[PDB]
Amino acid sequence: MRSRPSFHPLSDELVNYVNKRNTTWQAGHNFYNVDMSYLKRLCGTFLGGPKPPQRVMFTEDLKLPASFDAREQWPQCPTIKEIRDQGSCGSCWAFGAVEAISDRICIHTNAHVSVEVSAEDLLTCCGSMCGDGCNGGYPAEAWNFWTRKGLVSGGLYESHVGCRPYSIPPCEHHVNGSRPPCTGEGDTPKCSKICEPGYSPTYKQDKHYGYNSYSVSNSEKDIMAEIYKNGPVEGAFSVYSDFLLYKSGVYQHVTGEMMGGHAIRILGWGVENGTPYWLVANSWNTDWGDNGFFKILRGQDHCGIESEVVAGIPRTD
């Protein structure tokens, strides 16, 4: 391959052992031709550090469903079926924030205004408050910031939708080798308080603000409750190398080492083959795992999926 050895994505010994081990899932390569610094630049959420108020779902008489897909409950909100890609940027913290916010806006604005909240804006105008930009960040501040400063609107890279659409291109990690391995290297883009030409309203007239920012309790049922009456939520869990290989079924960490922390958007649950799972939306494109979504073992706070559930309500009127 003209270059030196080492860091070749992951070894087949992995894929195959994860498979011979015969567990709740099955793995296969999602990334082809990539510098391993990329595979670790994806996992750019910190874990630890802050944590909003608290949200205690009063249990009582509400019987939640044995399964649930936040996309079905609200077909009117297309935002829910969207899978974003973050390019070579550790902005996963900002994506879960916006992808969860996007939905909630459509959810709580009656089913009125559905709007692609901009990760571009959160990513580049939040600063040291939220963390480190393209090199890691705190989902707590992510929401805190929406409530403080508010976020404009911005679709996908080169989508021409709204004020500030994400400026980072996706890496062709999907499936090719005519180009070289899109290394995770990258710099955090600049805070440009300005909408795309031709776009109206004005950037300042595009900021959508939130109501408050709270933490969801570390109990699965409370979470099932939050997603059920409010809308998808942003989480955090630890990434180990095997997870990179997810193709289908319910994930369970088997081997490999920590790639780092990765935020996501949980938007549902169900039980597949007697294994309760959480339906989570990644930010690695639609060619990753199962059409961009994936399932992780729920109820046993797997890899910390049930620890960091940050979230909040949008500002009506």
Side-chain angles (χ1 to χ4, degrees), residues 75-108:
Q76 60 250 33
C77 299
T79 23
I80 303 190
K81 319 204 291 298
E82 162 163 88
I83 295 301
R84 313 217 192 197
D85 189 338
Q86 55 195 57
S88 349
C89 179
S91 39
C92 51
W93 54 273
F95 281 91
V98 309
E99 300 171 77
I101 283 169
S102 290
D103 302 4
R104 301 215 153 196
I105 282 179
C106 181
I107 285 177
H108 302 318

PDB file of all heavy atoms in Angstrom, residues 75-108:
ATOM      1  N   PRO A  75     -44.372  10.000  12.930  1.00  0.00           N
ATOM      2  CA  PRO A  75     -43.953   9.854  11.527  1.00  0.00           C
ATOM      3  C   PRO A  75     -43.782  11.247  10.910  1.00  0.00           C
ATOM      4  O   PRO A  75     -43.003  11.445   9.969  1.00  0.00           O
ATOM      5  CB  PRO A  75     -45.118   9.086  10.892  1.00  0.00           C
ATOM      6  CG  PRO A  75     -45.799   8.437  12.057  1.00  0.00           C
ATOM      7  CD  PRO A  75     -45.743   9.501  13.111  1.00  0.00           C
ATOM      8  N   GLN A  76     -44.490  12.214  11.493  1.00  0.00           N
ATOM      9  CA  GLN A  76     -44.468  13.601  11.060  1.00  0.00           C
ATOM     10  C   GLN A  76     -43.089  14.247  11.213  1.00  0.00           C
ATOM     11  O   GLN A  76     -42.805  15.251  10.566  1.00  0.00           O
ATOM     12  CB  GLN A  76     -45.490  14.400  11.869  1.00  0.00           C
ATOM     13  CG  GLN A  76     -45.208  14.382  13.373  1.00  0.00           C
ATOM     14  CD  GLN A  76     -46.232  13.575  14.169  1.00  0.00           C
ATOM     15  OE1 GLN A  76     -46.771  12.584  13.679  1.00  0.00           O
ATOM     16  NE2 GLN A  76     -46.500  14.001  15.404  1.00  0.00           N
ATOM     17  N   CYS A  77     -42.237  13.685  12.064  1.00  0.00           N
ATOM     18  CA  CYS A  77     -40.915  14.260  12.284  1.00  0.00           C
ATOM     19  C   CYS A  77     -39.795  13.452  11.640  1.00  0.00           C
ATOM     20  O   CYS A  77     -39.163  12.624  12.281  1.00  0.00           O
ATOM     21  CB  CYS A  77     -40.685  14.441  13.785  1.00  0.00           C
ATOM     22  SG  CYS A  77     -41.886  15.569  14.574  1.00  0.00           S
ATOM     23  N   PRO A  78     -39.494  13.734  10.366  1.00  0.00           N
ATOM     24  CA  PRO A  78     -38.467  13.077   9.553  1.00  0.00           C
ATOM     25  C   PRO A  78     -37.104  13.135  10.162  1.00  0.00           C
ATOM     26  O   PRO A  78     -36.256  12.294   9.882  1.00  0.00           O
ATOM     27  CB  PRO A  78     -38.475  13.890   8.277  1.00  0.00           C
ATOM     28  CG  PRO A  78     -39.814  14.518   8.269  1.00  0.00           C
ATOM     29  CD  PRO A  78     -39.971  14.934   9.678  1.00  0.00           C
ATOM     30  N   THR A  79     -36.891  14.164  10.959  1.00  0.00           N
ATOM     31  CA  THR A  79     -35.636  14.367  11.638  1.00  0.00           C
ATOM     32  C   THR A  79     -35.230  13.106  12.411  1.00  0.00           C
ATOM     33  O   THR A  79     -34.045  12.768  12.484  1.00  0.00           O
ATOM     34  CB  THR A  79     -35.765  15.531  12.617  1.00  0.00           C
ATOM     35  OG1 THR A  79     -37.145  15.715  12.956  1.00  0.00           O
ATOM     36  CG2 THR A  79     -35.220  16.797  12.013  1.00  0.00           C
ATOM     37  N   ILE A  80     -36.221  12.383  12.931  1.00  0.00           N
ATOM     38  CA  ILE A  80     -35.972  11.176  13.704  1.00  0.00           C
ATOM     39  C   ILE A  80     -35.312  10.042  12.940  1.00  0.00           C
ATOM     40  O   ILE A  80     -34.531   9.286  13.512  1.00  0.00           O
ATOM     41  CB  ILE A  80     -37.254  10.661  14.341  1.00  0.00           C
ATOM     42  CG1 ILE A  80     -37.897  11.732  15.222  1.00  0.00           C
ATOM     43  CG2 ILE A  80     -36.931   9.505  15.226  1.00  0.00           C
ATOM     44  CD1 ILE A  80     -39.047  11.194  16.071  1.00  0.00           C
ATOM     45  N   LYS A  81     -35.597   9.958  11.639  1.00  0.00           N
ATOM     46  CA  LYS A  81     -35.071   8.914  10.733  1.00  0.00           C
ATOM     47  C   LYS A  81     -33.727   9.301  10.105  1.00  0.00           C
ATOM     48  O   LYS A  81     -33.210   8.591   9.254  1.00  0.00           O
ATOM     49  CB  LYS A  81     -36.067   8.641   9.589  1.00  0.00           C
ATOM     50  CG  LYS A  81     -37.532   8.598   9.998  1.00  0.00           C
ATOM     51  CD  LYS A  81     -38.351   7.776   9.021  1.00  0.00           C
ATOM     52  CE  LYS A  81     -38.459   8.472   7.671  1.00  0.00           C
ATOM     53  NZ  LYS A  81     -39.155   9.782   7.790  1.00  0.00           N
ATOM     54  N   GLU A  82     -33.218  10.472  10.463  1.00  0.00           N
ATOM     55  CA  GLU A  82     -31.956  10.970   9.937  1.00  0.00           C
ATOM     56  C   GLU A  82     -30.732  10.443  10.654  1.00  0.00           C
ATOM     57  O   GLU A  82     -30.694  10.403  11.886  1.00  0.00           O
ATOM     58  CB  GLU A  82     -31.928  12.486  10.020  1.00  0.00           C
ATOM     59  CG  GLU A  82     -30.535  13.114   9.908  1.00  0.00           C
ATOM     60  CD  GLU A  82     -30.599  14.602   9.573  1.00  0.00           C
ATOM     61  OE1 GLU A  82     -30.690  15.422  10.520  1.00  0.00           O
ATOM     62  OE2 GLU A  82     -30.586  14.944   8.363  1.00  0.00           O
ATOM     63  N   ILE A  83     -29.728  10.072   9.857  1.00  0.00           N
ATOM     64  CA  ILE A  83     -28.434   9.583  10.338  1.00  0.00           C
ATOM     65  C   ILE A  83     -27.406  10.591   9.834  1.00  0.00           C
ATOM     66  O   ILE A  83     -27.303  10.809   8.626  1.00  0.00           O
ATOM     67  CB  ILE A  83     -28.089   8.241   9.721  1.00  0.00           C
ATOM     68  CG1 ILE A  83     -29.083   7.203  10.202  1.00  0.00           C
ATOM     69  CG2 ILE A  83     -26.680   7.869  10.054  1.00  0.00           C
ATOM     70  CD1 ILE A  83     -29.095   7.060  11.702  1.00  0.00           C
ATOM     71  N   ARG A  84     -26.660  11.217  10.734  1.00  0.00           N
ATOM     72  CA  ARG A  84     -25.664  12.195  10.305  1.00  0.00           C
ATOM     73  C   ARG A  84     -24.273  11.569  10.247  1.00  0.00           C
ATOM     74  O   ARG A  84     -24.077  10.428  10.681  1.00  0.00           O
ATOM     75  CB  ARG A  84     -25.662  13.383  11.259  1.00  0.00           C
ATOM     76  CG  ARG A  84     -27.046  13.902  11.560  1.00  0.00           C
ATOM     77  CD  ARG A  84     -27.069  15.422  11.678  1.00  0.00           C
ATOM     78  NE  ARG A  84     -28.337  15.875  12.237  1.00  0.00           N
ATOM     79  CZ  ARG A  84     -28.790  17.119  12.163  1.00  0.00           C
ATOM     80  NH1 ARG A  84     -28.077  18.042  11.544  1.00  0.00           N
ATOM     81  NH2 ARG A  84     -29.976  17.427  12.677  1.00  0.00           N
ATOM     82  N   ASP A  85     -23.309  12.312   9.714  1.00  0.00           N
ATOM     83  CA  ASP A  85     -21.928  11.839   9.621  1.00  0.00           C
ATOM     84  C   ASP A  85     -21.111  13.026  10.077  1.00  0.00           C
ATOM     85  O   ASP A  85     -21.410  14.157   9.690  1.00  0.00           O
ATOM     86  CB  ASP A  85     -21.554  11.470   8.173  1.00  0.00           C
ATOM     87  CG  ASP A  85     -20.195  10.766   8.072  1.00  0.00           C
ATOM     88  OD1 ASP A  85     -19.345  10.902   8.986  1.00  0.00           O
ATOM     89  OD2 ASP A  85     -19.973  10.059   7.067  1.00  0.00           O
ATOM     90  N   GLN A  86     -20.070  12.779  10.863  1.00  0.00           N
ATOM     91  CA  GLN A  86     -19.240  13.862  11.378  1.00  0.00           C
ATOM     92  C   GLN A  86     -17.870  14.070  10.725  1.00  0.00           C
ATOM     93  O   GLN A  86     -17.066  14.866  11.222  1.00  0.00           O
ATOM     94  CB  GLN A  86     -19.048  13.672  12.866  1.00  0.00           C
ATOM     95  CG  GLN A  86     -18.487  12.338  13.174  1.00  0.00           C
ATOM     96  CD  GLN A  86     -18.624  11.985  14.619  1.00  0.00           C
ATOM     97  OE1 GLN A  86     -19.725  11.962  15.166  1.00  0.00           O
ATOM     98  NE2 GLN A  86     -17.493  11.747  15.274  1.00  0.00           N
ATOM     99  N   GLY A  87     -17.598  13.387   9.619  1.00  0.00           N
ATOM    100  CA  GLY A  87     -16.298  13.513   8.984  1.00  0.00           C
ATOM    101  C   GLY A  87     -15.200  13.140   9.966  1.00  0.00           C
ATOM    102  O   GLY A  87     -15.440  12.380  10.903  1.00  0.00           O
ATOM    103  N   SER A  88     -14.000  13.682   9.787  1.00  0.00           N
ATOM    104  CA  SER A  88     -12.882  13.383  10.682  1.00  0.00           C
ATOM    105  C   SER A  88     -12.906  14.343  11.862  1.00  0.00           C
ATOM    106  O   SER A  88     -11.889  14.951  12.192  1.00  0.00           O
ATOM    107  CB  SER A  88     -11.552  13.541   9.941  1.00  0.00           C
ATOM    108  OG  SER A  88     -11.774  13.691   8.541  1.00  0.00           O
ATOM    109  N   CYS A  89     -14.057  14.484  12.510  1.00  0.00           N
ATOM    110  CA  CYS A  89     -14.160  15.399  13.637  1.00  0.00           C
ATOM    111  C   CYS A  89     -14.778  14.748  14.870  1.00  0.00           C
ATOM    112  O   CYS A  89     -15.801  14.074  14.772  1.00  0.00           O
ATOM    113  CB  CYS A  89     -14.975  16.639  13.238  1.00  0.00           C
ATOM    114  SG  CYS A  89     -15.214  17.866  14.563  1.00  0.00           S
ATOM    115  N   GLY A  90     -14.142  14.940  16.027  1.00  0.00           N
ATOM    116  CA  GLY A  90     -14.660  14.409  17.282  1.00  0.00           C
ATOM    117  C   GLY A  90     -15.796  15.284  17.784  1.00  0.00           C
ATOM    118  O   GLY A  90     -15.760  15.789  18.888  1.00  0.00           O
ATOM    119  N   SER A  91     -16.810  15.458  16.947  1.00  0.00           N
ATOM    120  CA  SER A  91     -17.967  16.267  17.280  1.00  0.00           C
ATOM    121  C   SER A  91     -19.196  15.459  17.685  1.00  0.00           C
ATOM    122  O   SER A  91     -20.269  16.025  17.880  1.00  0.00           O
ATOM    123  CB  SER A  91     -18.317  17.204  16.114  1.00  0.00           C
ATOM    124  OG  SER A  91     -18.155  16.583  14.851  1.00  0.00           O
ATOM    125  N   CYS A  92     -19.023  14.153  17.876  1.00  0.00           N
ATOM    126  CA  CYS A  92     -20.121  13.271  18.281  1.00  0.00           C
ATOM    127  C   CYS A  92     -20.954  13.845  19.428  1.00  0.00           C
ATOM    128  O   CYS A  92     -22.165  13.636  19.493  1.00  0.00           O
ATOM    129  CB  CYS A  92     -19.609  11.864  18.648  1.00  0.00           C
ATOM    130  SG  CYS A  92     -18.254  11.758  19.819  1.00  0.00           S
ATOM    131  N   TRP A  93     -20.297  14.590  20.310  1.00  0.00           N
ATOM    132  CA  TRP A  93     -20.933  15.227  21.457  1.00  0.00           C
ATOM    133  C   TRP A  93     -21.967  16.244  21.010  1.00  0.00           C
ATOM    134  O   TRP A  93     -23.018  16.391  21.622  1.00  0.00           O
ATOM    135  CB  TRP A  93     -19.886  15.974  22.259  1.00  0.00           C
ATOM    136  CG  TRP A  93     -19.070  16.954  21.439  1.00  0.00           C
ATOM    137  CD1 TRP A  93     -17.936  16.673  20.740  1.00  0.00           C
ATOM    138  CD2 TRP A  93     -19.236  18.367  21.375  1.00  0.00           C
ATOM    139  NE1 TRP A  93     -17.369  17.819  20.272  1.00  0.00           N
ATOM    140  CE2 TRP A  93     -18.147  18.879  20.646  1.00  0.00           C
ATOM    141  CE3 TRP A  93     -20.189  19.253  21.875  1.00  0.00           C
ATOM    142  CZ2 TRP A  93     -17.981  20.229  20.406  1.00  0.00           C
ATOM    143  CZ3 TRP A  93     -20.024  20.600  21.632  1.00  0.00           C
ATOM    144  CH2 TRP A  93     -18.927  21.076  20.902  1.00  0.00           C
ATOM    145  N   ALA A  94     -21.624  16.993  19.964  1.00  0.00           N
ATOM    146  CA  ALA A  94     -22.485  18.035  19.421  1.00  0.00           C
ATOM    147  C   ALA A  94     -23.589  17.485  18.527  1.00  0.00           C
ATOM    148  O   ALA A  94     -24.658  18.075  18.412  1.00  0.00           O
ATOM    149  CB  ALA A  94     -21.638  19.055  18.689  1.00  0.00           C
ATOM    150  N   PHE A  95     -23.329  16.340  17.911  1.00  0.00           N
ATOM    151  CA  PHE A  95     -24.315  15.718  17.048  1.00  0.00           C
ATOM    152  C   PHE A  95     -25.462  15.154  17.845  1.00  0.00           C
ATOM    153  O   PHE A  95     -26.607  15.516  17.600  1.00  0.00           O
ATOM    154  CB  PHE A  95     -23.688  14.635  16.178  1.00  0.00           C
ATOM    155  CG  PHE A  95     -22.968  15.178  14.996  1.00  0.00           C
ATOM    156  CD1 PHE A  95     -21.620  15.481  15.083  1.00  0.00           C
ATOM    157  CD2 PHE A  95     -23.653  15.460  13.828  1.00  0.00           C
ATOM    158  CE1 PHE A  95     -20.961  16.069  14.026  1.00  0.00           C
ATOM    159  CE2 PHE A  95     -23.010  16.047  12.762  1.00  0.00           C
ATOM    160  CZ  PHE A  95     -21.656  16.358  12.857  1.00  0.00           C
ATOM    161  N   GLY A  96     -25.173  14.302  18.818  1.00  0.00           N
ATOM    162  CA  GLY A  96     -26.250  13.749  19.617  1.00  0.00           C
ATOM    163  C   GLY A  96     -27.093  14.860  20.187  1.00  0.00           C
ATOM    164  O   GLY A  96     -28.316  14.776  20.244  1.00  0.00           O
ATOM    165  N   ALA A  97     -26.416  15.934  20.561  1.00  0.00           N
ATOM    166  CA  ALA A  97     -27.072  17.115  21.085  1.00  0.00           C
ATOM    167  C   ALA A  97     -28.082  17.626  20.079  1.00  0.00           C
ATOM    168  O   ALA A  97     -29.281  17.614  20.341  1.00  0.00           O
ATOM    169  CB  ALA A  97     -26.050  18.187  21.372  1.00  0.00           C
ATOM    170  N   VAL A  98     -27.611  18.003  18.893  1.00  0.00           N
ATOM    171  CA  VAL A  98     -28.490  18.536  17.857  1.00  0.00           C
ATOM    172  C   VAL A  98     -29.499  17.580  17.241  1.00  0.00           C
ATOM    173  O   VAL A  98     -30.614  17.976  16.958  1.00  0.00           O
ATOM    174  CB  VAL A  98     -27.702  19.250  16.748  1.00  0.00           C
ATOM    175  CG1 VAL A  98     -26.765  20.241  17.354  1.00  0.00           C
ATOM    176  CG2 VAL A  98     -26.946  18.283  15.907  1.00  0.00           C
ATOM    177  N   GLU A  99     -29.126  16.323  17.048  1.00  0.00           N
ATOM    178  CA  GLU A  99     -30.034  15.343  16.465  1.00  0.00           C
ATOM    179  C   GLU A  99     -31.184  15.093  17.425  1.00  0.00           C
ATOM    180  O   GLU A  99     -32.315  14.878  17.005  1.00  0.00           O
ATOM    181  CB  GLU A  99     -29.305  14.042  16.149  1.00  0.00           C
ATOM    182  CG  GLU A  99     -28.149  14.177  15.174  1.00  0.00           C
ATOM    183  CD  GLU A  99     -27.344  12.908  15.062  1.00  0.00           C
ATOM    184  OE1 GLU A  99     -27.805  11.970  14.392  1.00  0.00           O
ATOM    185  OE2 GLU A  99     -26.246  12.842  15.639  1.00  0.00           O
ATOM    186  N   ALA A 100     -30.893  15.139  18.720  1.00  0.00           N
ATOM    187  CA  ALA A 100     -31.916  14.943  19.743  1.00  0.00           C
ATOM    188  C   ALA A 100     -32.751  16.203  19.892  1.00  0.00           C
ATOM    189  O   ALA A 100     -33.958  16.126  20.107  1.00  0.00           O
ATOM    190  CB  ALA A 100     -31.284  14.574  21.066  1.00  0.00           C
ATOM    191  N   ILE A 101     -32.101  17.360  19.766  1.00  0.00           N
ATOM    192  CA  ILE A 101     -32.765  18.660  19.862  1.00  0.00           C
ATOM    193  C   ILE A 101     -33.697  18.823  18.666  1.00  0.00           C
ATOM    194  O   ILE A 101     -34.870  19.146  18.841  1.00  0.00           O
ATOM    195  CB  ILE A 101     -31.738  19.832  19.861  1.00  0.00           C
ATOM    196  CG1 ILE A 101     -31.071  19.972  21.229  1.00  0.00           C
ATOM    197  CG2 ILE A 101     -32.415  21.149  19.522  1.00  0.00           C
ATOM    198  CD1 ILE A 101     -29.897  20.890  21.234  1.00  0.00           C
ATOM    199  N   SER A 102     -33.176  18.543  17.466  1.00  0.00           N
ATOM    200  CA  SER A 102     -33.912  18.645  16.199  1.00  0.00           C
ATOM    201  C   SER A 102     -35.290  18.020  16.332  1.00  0.00           C
ATOM    202  O   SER A 102     -36.313  18.647  16.036  1.00  0.00           O
ATOM    203  CB  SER A 102     -33.163  17.915  15.073  1.00  0.00           C
ATOM    204  OG  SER A 102     -31.968  18.563  14.676  1.00  0.00           O
ATOM    205  N   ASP A 103     -35.287  16.756  16.748  1.00  0.00           N
ATOM    206  CA  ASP A 103     -36.495  15.967  16.946  1.00  0.00           C
ATOM    207  C   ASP A 103     -37.408  16.663  17.925  1.00  0.00           C
ATOM    208  O   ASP A 103     -38.518  17.056  17.571  1.00  0.00           O
ATOM    209  CB  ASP A 103     -36.144  14.584  17.507  1.00  0.00           C
ATOM    210  CG  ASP A 103     -35.193  13.786  16.603  1.00  0.00           C
ATOM    211  OD1 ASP A 103     -34.738  14.326  15.573  1.00  0.00           O
ATOM    212  OD2 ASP A 103     -34.901  12.606  16.927  1.00  0.00           O
ATOM    213  N   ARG A 104     -36.920  16.825  19.155  1.00  0.00           N
ATOM    214  CA  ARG A 104     -37.681  17.458  20.235  1.00  0.00           C
ATOM    215  C   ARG A 104     -38.377  18.755  19.794  1.00  0.00           C
ATOM    216  O   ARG A 104     -39.501  19.029  20.220  1.00  0.00           O
ATOM    217  CB  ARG A 104     -36.799  17.710  21.467  1.00  0.00           C
ATOM    218  CG  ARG A 104     -36.171  16.486  22.046  1.00  0.00           C
ATOM    219  CD  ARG A 104     -36.067  16.549  23.520  1.00  0.00           C
ATOM    220  NE  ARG A 104     -36.069  15.210  24.056  1.00  0.00           N
ATOM    221  CZ  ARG A 104     -36.299  14.915  25.325  1.00  0.00           C
ATOM    222  NH1 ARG A 104     -36.534  15.876  26.214  1.00  0.00           N
ATOM    223  NH2 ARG A 104     -36.310  13.653  25.713  1.00  0.00           N
ATOM    224  N   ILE A 105     -37.718  19.542  18.951  1.00  0.00           N
ATOM    225  CA  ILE A 105     -38.339  20.759  18.460  1.00  0.00           C
ATOM    226  C   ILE A 105     -39.609  20.341  17.704  1.00  0.00           C
ATOM    227  O   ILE A 105     -40.710  20.701  18.103  1.00  0.00           O
ATOM    228  CB  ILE A 105     -37.360  21.586  17.587  1.00  0.00           C
ATOM    229  CG1 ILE A 105     -36.395  22.324  18.500  1.00  0.00           C
ATOM    230  CG2 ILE A 105     -38.095  22.574  16.724  1.00  0.00           C
ATOM    231  CD1 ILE A 105     -35.380  23.145  17.779  1.00  0.00           C
ATOM    232  N   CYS A 106     -39.462  19.478  16.704  1.00  0.00           N
ATOM    233  CA  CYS A 106     -40.603  19.004  15.926  1.00  0.00           C
ATOM    234  C   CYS A 106     -41.648  18.322  16.805  1.00  0.00           C
ATOM    235  O   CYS A 106     -42.844  18.469  16.583  1.00  0.00           O
ATOM    236  CB  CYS A 106     -40.139  18.038  14.834  1.00  0.00           C
ATOM    237  SG  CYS A 106     -41.464  17.384  13.767  1.00  0.00           S
ATOM    238  N   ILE A 107     -41.178  17.598  17.812  1.00  0.00           N
ATOM    239  CA  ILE A 107     -42.030  16.863  18.740  1.00  0.00           C
ATOM    240  C   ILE A 107     -42.900  17.763  19.599  1.00  0.00           C
ATOM    241  O   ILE A 107     -44.106  17.557  19.734  1.00  0.00           O
ATOM    242  CB  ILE A 107     -41.149  16.007  19.679  1.00  0.00           C
ATOM    243  CG1 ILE A 107     -40.634  14.796  18.911  1.00  0.00           C
ATOM    244  CG2 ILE A 107     -41.904  15.593  20.952  1.00  0.00           C
ATOM    245  CD1 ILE A 107     -39.688  13.915  19.712  1.00  0.00           C
ATOM    246  N   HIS A 108     -42.260  18.734  20.224  1.00  0.00           N
ATOM    247  CA  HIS A 108     -42.942  19.623  21.130  1.00  0.00           C
ATOM    248  C   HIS A 108     -43.540  20.896  20.504  1.00  0.00           C
ATOM    249  O   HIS A 108     -44.364  21.577  21.125  1.00  0.00           O
ATOM    250  CB  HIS A 108     -42.001  19.935  22.301  1.00  0.00           C
ATOM    251  CG  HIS A 108     -41.532  18.722  23.057  1.00  0.00           C
ATOM    252  ND1 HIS A 108     -42.361  17.670  23.386  1.00  0.00           N
ATOM    253  CD2 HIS A 108     -40.338  18.444  23.634  1.00  0.00           C
ATOM    254  CE1 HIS A 108     -41.705  16.807  24.143  1.00  0.00           C
ATOM    255  NE2 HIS A 108     -40.475  17.256  24.309  1.00  0.00           N
TER     256      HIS A 108
END
